[PDB]
Amino acid sequence: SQERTTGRQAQISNITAAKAVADVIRTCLGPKAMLKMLLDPMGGLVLTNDGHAILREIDVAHPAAKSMLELSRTQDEEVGDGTTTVIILAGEILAQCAPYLIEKNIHPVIIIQALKKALTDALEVIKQVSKPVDVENDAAMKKLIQASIGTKYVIHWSEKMCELALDAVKTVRKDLGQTFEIDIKRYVRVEKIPGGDVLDSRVLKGVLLNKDVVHPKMSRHIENPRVVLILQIEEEQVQLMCEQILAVRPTLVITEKGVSDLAQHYLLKGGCSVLRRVKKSDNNRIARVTVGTNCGLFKVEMIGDEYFSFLDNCKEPLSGLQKACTIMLRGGSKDILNEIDRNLQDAMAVARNVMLSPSLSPGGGATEMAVSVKLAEKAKQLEGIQQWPYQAVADAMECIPRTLIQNAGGDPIRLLSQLRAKHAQGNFTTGIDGDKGKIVDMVSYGIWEPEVIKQQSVKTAIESACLLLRVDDIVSGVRK
C-alpha cells in the first residue's frame, strides 16, 4: 500500500479534508443555530447541537479531518463551555488558507513563520478588550449561565437551575490562599431521575450526602453530626464497625451496608439520629473537607423515589481546601431531562473560568471582530514576506461572525462595514445581535463571556493550525 501524495496533490487533498466539514458546521453557531442529525452504523440518529458527538459519529475518508476531532477534544477538556459559540472556531482557519497556498508557490514553513507571529499579537488583544468585575458577586454569574441555555425553554426554570450550580460553585473554590481560585467540580455529581420538579433539588454550602437514614420517621435533627472516614452475619459484622466509631463519641454514623436490628439497640442510646449506609463516592466528598469535627446540623427528607440527607459543617477551618457536595436533577419528563443536561452540566465550567480570569471579554461576535481589526492594523506595519499570509489571518477571524449572520440569511457586507467603525473606534462592546440580527451593545443586551473562554480557545485554535501547515506526505495501509 502507498496512498502517498506529492507535489500539488498533497496540499489540495489535505485542505479539502476539513473544508467540506466546515460548511456543515456553519449551522452550529449562535443562539439561532440549527440542530444537526447524525447517522450511526446501527441506523439510529442523535439530534443535538453539540459538535463533539457530531465529528465522532461522522466518518471522514480523509485522515486529515480526524485531527480536528482530537483538536476539538483538547478544547472540550480544557474549556468545554458553550461549544455553540466556541468549538466552531476549529474549522475557520484552514478554510481561509486556501486562496493563496500553491498559487503563490509559498513554502508552508514561510506560512508557519507568519503563524508564530500571529499568536504573539493575538495574546495582547485578548486581555486588552477584557474588563474586570467583582469576583465575589454571585448575581453576575446568574446572567452568564442564562446566555448559554437559550437553546431551550429552560429560561423559565433558569432561576432554580442557575442557583443549582452556583450554590456548588461558591461551595468548592479554595484550592489556594493566594498565587488564583483553582477548584475541582468533578467531585460534584449530578444525578438525573425522571419525574418530579426541578425545585426538588437541594443544594447549599456543605457536603450533601444522598442516602437515607435507618427509619424515615427518625428524628431529623442532630446536635453535632461528627463525620468519620444473612441476618446473623450482618448484625454482628456491621456492629463491629459503626459502634466502634463511637469511641470518639460521634453522633453521626457512616457504614458501607445497612443497619440490622441488633445494632439499633446500642446505636440509638447515644441520644441522636443514626445514619445507615452512605454512598461510596460521598466518602470522597467529605474527605476533602475534613476524624472530622465541627458539623453544624443534620437533616433528612422523605420522597418516594430516593431520600435525602443534609450534613452541614459550616466551619471548615479552626487554612483549608475546597468542599465537595452532591446535586440531584429532577426533570419534567424523560426526554426533557436528558436533553437539558448539556446546558446544566456545562454550567460547572461556566463559573470555573470566572474564578480563573475575573476579566470579561465581549461575546456575540465582538471578540472575533476585535482581533480581526488588530491583525489588519499590524499587517501594514510589519509588511515583509508576512504581508500576504498575516493579512489572511485577519480575514479568518472575520468569517467567524459571518457564520453567525448565515443563520439570519442576510448580507454580511452591510453589517461588517459598520463594525469596522463603531467597534474598533467606538468600543469593544459593539457586536452583532443574535435575536434581531442587528448591531447593539453586547453588555447592555447581556451577551458576554469570561476571558478564559476566548483566551484558551483562540490560543489553542492558532496552535491547532500548526499540524495543518506541517503536512507533506501521507502513508497509510500498513500496520501499527
Binding site: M34, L35, L39, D40, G43, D59, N407
Partner: protein, 508 residues
C-alpha cells in the same frame, strides 16, 4: 441542499396512522414473525414492531413513549401533525423562510395554547364519586377502541373497579390494581367483574371443598446399592417434615370438624401425598401456584404472606365471608366474594380467540389508565376535537393581541391554525363523508355560539355528519390528555424544523 431531502421523504409517514383515528375509523392487521396477531387502533403496537423506512420515524415512535404513561389512545395526532407540518414546508418554507422562523411561532403558540387550555376545560367533582359522570366518560373512551357491544359490558366494570380504590385524600394508584386475567372462554361480551379477589387455581381432587364460606389461606458416594436407598429415604423425609407439621398446626382453630373451607397455596411443587393426608381433614392444596398474587390477600382477611412452612401463626389465617369455585377448562378458579372491606379488585376477561382478546386487552389497559387521570385531576376537557377547532379560530385572528415579530411569526401562526384542522377532517374522512361540508357547519355553530353571548362547546357527530354537544353525547377527555399532548406537539414539531442536514455515511 439536503434540507429538502428529509422534508419530502418523511412526508409520506402521515398515511400510516391516518385512518386509525376516530371511533368510526378502521383497523389495520399487523403480524410479526412469532405468530402474534395484533389488530387494534392503538399506536404503541403499530409503531413498535412495524418496520420503518425513513429514519425520521425513530423520533416519532419514541415520542409515543410519553403518551403511553399518560394517554395511550388517540396518539395518531402525533403523526398527523408532523405530516401537515412537512406539507407546510413545501408552501411557506419553499418561499425561502428560514426553518427557525416558523419554529419560533410554534413555541409562542405553545404558551398561548396553555392559556386557552384552562378556559376550555370544565371542572367536575370527584369527591362525591358520581357514577353518572364515569359512565359517560368510559362510554366514549371505549368507542375509539372496541364496538358498542363490549362498551356496554365494560362500562360498569371499569366504573366499579375505580371505586374500590379511593380514600379521604382521593389516592388512586395504577400500581395497586394491576393483575388482569387473560383467558379464552365463552364470548368477549361475557366478561364479568368481581368485587373481590380472583384466584387462578383450584381444587385438584374430588374431595376438595366446592363451595365454602370461611377459608383459611396458608401461603407457601455409597459402597453398596442398599446404602443408596438410605439417601432416597432421607430425601422423602424432607418433604414429609413439611406435610406432617401442617396436619398438627391446622388443628389450631378446629381440626376435628372439616365443615369449613381450607386453603394451602405453594409456589413450587409439593409431595402428591398431601392430597391423601388432606382428604381426611378436607384441606385444599394447589399445584404450581403463583407468588405475587398472594400480596393482595393481606388487604381482605388481614392475613400475612408466608414463604416457608416453619413459621405459621393464626394471624396468617383470615376469615372470609364466601368462597366460590368455578371449573373452566383445565384450570379451576377460586372466587373470593362477600368481602368485608376489599381494597382491590381483579379483572377477569373472557373471550373466544387470540385476536378477540387482543382488542379487549388493549382496551382494558388503556381504559383503566384513562379513567385514572379522571379521578386524579378533576378538570375534564370536552373531546370530539372541539378544542382543536376552537383553538384554530382563536389564533387565526390575533393582530394586536398576540403578534410578535411582524410577518415572521404571522406566517407560522397560520400554519399552526391550519395544522390542527386536519384532525377533524381526518375524523370525517374515516367516516366517509365530505370534510368540507361538515367543517363549514361546525364553524357556523361556533360563530352562532359566540354571537349569542353564551359559552357553549360544540362537538362533531360522525354518524349523521352534523354538530353535536360533547356534554350530552358523553365524549370527554382528561385535562392531562391534552396537557402532555400539546406540550409534546411542539417538541415533535421542533425536531424536524430545527433539523438541518442529514449525511449518508458510517462505519461498515
Amino acid at each position: 441542499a439536503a434540507l429538502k431531502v428529509n422534508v419530502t421523504s418523511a412526508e409520506g409517514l402521515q398515511s400510516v396512522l391516518e385512518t386509525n383515528l376516530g371511533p368510526k375509523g378502521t383497523l389495520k392487521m399487523l403480524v410479526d414473525g412469532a405468530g402474534n396477531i395484533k389488530l387494534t387502533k392503538d399506536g404503541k403496537v403499530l409503531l413498535t414492531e412495524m418496520q420503518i423506512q425513513s429514519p425520521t420515524a425513530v423520533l416519532i415512535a419514541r415520542a409515543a413513549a410519553a403518551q403511553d404513561e399518560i394517554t395511550g389512545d388517540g396518539t395518531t395526532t402525533v403523526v398527523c401533525l408532523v405530516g401537515e407540518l412537512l406539507r407546510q414546508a413545501h408552501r411557506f418554507i419553499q418561499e425561502g423562510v428560514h426553518p427557525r422562523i416558523i419554529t419560533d411561532g410554534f413555541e409562542i403558540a405553545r404558551k398561548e395554547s396553555m392559556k386557552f387550555l384552562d378556559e376550555f376545560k370544565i371542572s367536575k367533582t370527584n369527591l362525591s364519586n358520581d357514577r353518572e359522570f364515569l359512565l359517560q366518560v368510559a362510554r366514549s373512551s371505549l368507542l375509539t377502541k372496541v364496538d358498542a357491544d363490549l362498551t356496554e359490558v365494560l362500562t360498569p366494570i371499569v366504573t366499579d373497579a375505580v371505586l374500590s380504590v379511593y380514600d379521604a385524600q382521593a389516592d388512586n394508584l395504577d400500581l395497586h390494581m394491576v393483575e388482569i386475567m387473560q383467558m379464552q372462554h365463552l364470548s368477549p361480551k361475557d366478561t364479568t367483574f368481581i368485587k373481590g379477589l380472583v384466584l387462578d387455581h383450584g381444587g385438584r381432587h374430588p374431595d376438595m371443598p366446592t363451595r365454602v364460606k370461611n377459608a383459611y389461606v396458608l401461603i407457601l458416594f455409597y459402597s453398596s446399592a442398599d446404602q443408596r436407598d438410605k439417601l432416597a429415604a432421607s430425601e422423602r423425609k424432607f418433604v414429609d417434615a413439611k406435610l406432617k407439621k401442617i396436619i398438627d398446626l391446622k388443628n389450631e382453630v378446629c381440626g376435628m370438624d372439616p365443615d369449613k373451607g381450607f386453603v394451602i397455596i405453594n409456589q413450587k411443587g409439593i409431595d402428591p401425598m398431601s392430597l391423601d393426608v388432606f382428604a381426611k381433614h378436607n384441606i385444599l392444596a394447589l399445584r404450581r401456584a403463583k407468588r405475587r398474587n398472594m400480596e393482595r390477600l393481606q388487604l381482605v382477611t388481614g392475613g400475612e404472606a408466608q414463604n416457608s412452612v416453619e413459621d405459621l401463626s393464626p394471624q396468617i389465617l383470615g376469615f372470609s365471608g364466601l368462597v366460590y369455585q368455578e371449573t373452566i377448562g383445565e384450570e379451576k378458579f377460586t372466587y373470593v366474594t362477600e368481602n368485608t372491606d376489599p381494597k382491590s379488585c381483579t379483572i377477569l376477561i373472557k373471550g373466544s380467540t387470540h385476536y378477540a382478546l387482543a382488542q379487549t386487552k388493549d382496551a382494558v389497559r388503556d381504559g383503566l389508565r384513562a379513567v385514572a387521570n379522571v379521578l386524579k385531576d378533576k378538570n375534564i376537557i370536552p373531546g370530539a376535537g372541539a378544542f382543536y377547532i376552537a383553538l384554530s379560530r382563536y389564533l387565526r385572528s390575533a393582530n394586536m393581541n398576540k403578534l410578535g415579530a411582524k410577518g415572521k411569526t404571522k406566517t407560522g401562526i397560520e400554519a399552526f391554525a391550519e395544522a390542527l384542522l386536519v384532525i377533524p377532517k381526518t375524523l370525517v374522512k374515516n367516516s366517509g363523508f365530505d370534510p368540507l361540508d361538515v367543517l363549514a357547519m361546525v364553524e357556523d355553530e361556533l360563530d352562532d355560539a359566540q354571537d349569542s353571548d353564551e359559552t357553549r362547546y360544540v362537538g362533531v357527530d360522525l354518524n349523521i355528519g352534523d354538530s353535536c354537544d360533547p356534554t350530552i353525547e358523553g365524549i370527554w377527555d382528561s385535562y392531562r390528555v391534552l396537557r402532555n399532548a400539546i406540550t409534546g406537539a411542539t417538541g415533535i414539531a421542533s425536531n424536524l424544523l430545527l433539523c438541518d442536514e442529514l449525511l449518508r455515511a458510517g462505519r461498515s
